[PDB]
Design a protein around this ligand. Sequence first.
Ligand SMILES: Nc1ncnc2c1ncn2[C@@H]1O[C@H](CSCC[C@H](N)C(=O)O)[C@@H](O)[C@H]1O
Ligand code: NA
Lengths: 265, 265
Amino acid sequence: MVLYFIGLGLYDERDITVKGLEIAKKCDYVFAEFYTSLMAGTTLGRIQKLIGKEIRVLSREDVELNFENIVLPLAKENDVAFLTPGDPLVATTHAELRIRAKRAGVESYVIHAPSIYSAVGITGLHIYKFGKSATVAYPEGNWFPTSYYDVIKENAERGLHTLLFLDIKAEKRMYMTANEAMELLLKVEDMKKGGVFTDDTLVVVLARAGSLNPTIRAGYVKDLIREDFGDPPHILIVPGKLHIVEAEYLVEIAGAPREMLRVNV
Amino acid sequence: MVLYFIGLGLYDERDITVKGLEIAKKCDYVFAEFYTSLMAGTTLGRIQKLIGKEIRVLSREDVELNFENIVLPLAKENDVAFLTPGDPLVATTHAELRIRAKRAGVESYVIHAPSIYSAVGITGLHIYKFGKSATVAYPEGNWFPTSYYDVIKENAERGLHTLLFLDIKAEKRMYMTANEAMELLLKVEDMKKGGVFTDDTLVVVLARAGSLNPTIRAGYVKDLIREDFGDPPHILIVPGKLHIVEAEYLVEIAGAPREMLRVNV
Ligand SMILES: Nc1ncnc2c1ncn2[C@@H]1O[C@H](CSCC[C@H](N)C(=O)O)[C@@H](O)[C@H]1O
Ligand code: NA
């Protein structure tokens, strides 16, 4: 009669909380999805070994179209867990799944875990300063989406930072690199001409948040657009005007260029 | 030899990540601060038991003025951990502590944990739609803070949701309730008369996120301002423009008035 939405955390199998693990171990059935994000520092096998339960993976269609006939039926007579990377309900559509549970007479509880939304705090950028967030999508066919560029413009205009998620093809396991993200934004700038993203724009790249050795880099596009940030996934941030302490942290921790202490503060 | 910034999570000792627990267990010295937030479902005793180490609690003064005198010295010859509620670098000034560590020749690592910043997901509000965040502070003497009101105005203007961290006076055991926050806001509205926060404003309250049964309520200020939302900690959220599914979740899960199902596009 109970469904537990349990977050898996940022990087590897140890990013799940003690509460989430203990609850997952007591569940009769455990489902998981890895289409919204992928746990780059571990594997399904390692996660299954830690939880000590067989994990049935669900595709996007399984969830969005058939959550009520795949997961909920079992949650009516047993304790069921639904595992997701990061913090449950961060993914836009996930919250609605609790409404489906209700309508099916199934109770649901949420067990939180670290999310990139809060983990980006490791860049030294003040969390309260983040504005609306967005996702950089690949252009294709006759479709060139550029809304993420407008998001950056509006936030920046108000001195706010912009958290940018990069495109991902979970199934195909193909990621968009921060490098590719920068190339696309430069292309959009050439069309929009809004002076929002140029070779002189200061950006921050975060890779493998959650690991003991994440990659945190900050600098100007002209210098970072060809740098090697390691294996995906990458997160790109376009910070608004920086608080002095933010710039110093980037300089001291992320090896940012001295220049930003005077140019972007 | 090294310093660990380890987050403890939202509610109780089990909100720490497996990674954080296993590392905390093998540290020679463990320090902690419990003034940046309230973990209403645990005690120092329970935390010490889980980690199996004695924890020396530091005050805001100990940290902000003497971190390099109390913590760092030991990190030069031992493995030290500094524990904090939620995520160590979120809505705190702890990021700056890493600079002190570096300048002292001490390498540091960060172990994230569930944070209120991402936990807002349980409100059903799309996380990407939150804009600049703010803190509602207790007026002090003739000083009556009001900046948070302008933040709400800026966000609502963009149709973005506003997350409001609430004040805390740890040494006085004082934790601002959502009720007190709304009262202060109504008073600021009377002074500024910007039509930003009135009795008809839709607000969302999230109390004791992280527990298995947090209080999640949504509705008009006039109806919520005197409602008992349970023990602290609380956060107040003032949504911007709602998507259909957001409104639906507020009604179905947060008990909002069914008329809120209708949205003014
Ligand atoms: N579990 C919880 N439930 C509701 N509000 C919470 C909360 N934890 C923190 N808060 C809010 O956040 C404020 C502290 S700011 C510190 C946040 C912490 N670093 C984190 O990552 O979560 C509290 O005063 C309250 O306003
Ligand atoms: Na945000």
